[PDB]
Amino acid sequence: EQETLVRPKPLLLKLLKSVGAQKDTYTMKEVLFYLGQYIMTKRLYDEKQQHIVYCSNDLLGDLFGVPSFSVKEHRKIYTMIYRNLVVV
């Protein structure tokens, strides 16, 4: 169907494990959900403009390869996430 099964690379797995359960494979939906929770728990967003995330000083910044991004940049977020996993 439309569901996507994935296997996160080492660093993304570390990211995911800090807020969720360890699994051999995850769905893209699960990954997106956990990343949101990770960003929230670490308060990486701007309190006064919460659709803006600054990740340069965080593991997420190392994974995505950018200092910051807007939650509205869907293509960017999806492509950056795909660059950190393998589709099964």
Partner 1 sequence: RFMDYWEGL
Tell me the number of residues near partner 1 by CB under 8 A: 12
Q: Is 34 strand, coil or helix? A: helix
Structure tokens at 49: 């403009």
Query: Which among 50, 67, 49, 70 has a CA at the least distance from the CA of 58?
Result: 67
Can residue 51 be called a binding residue for partner 1 (CB under 8 A)? yes
Stretch that binds partner 1, among 5-13, 15-23, 58-66, 74-82 (CB under 8 A): 74-82
Can residue 36 be called a binding residue for partner 1 (CB under 8 A)? yes
Can residue 54 be called a binding residue for partner 1 (CB under 8 A)? no
Can residue 6 be called a binding residue for partner 1 (CB under 8 A)? no
Contact status, residue 85 vs residue 9, Cβ threshold 8 Å:
yes
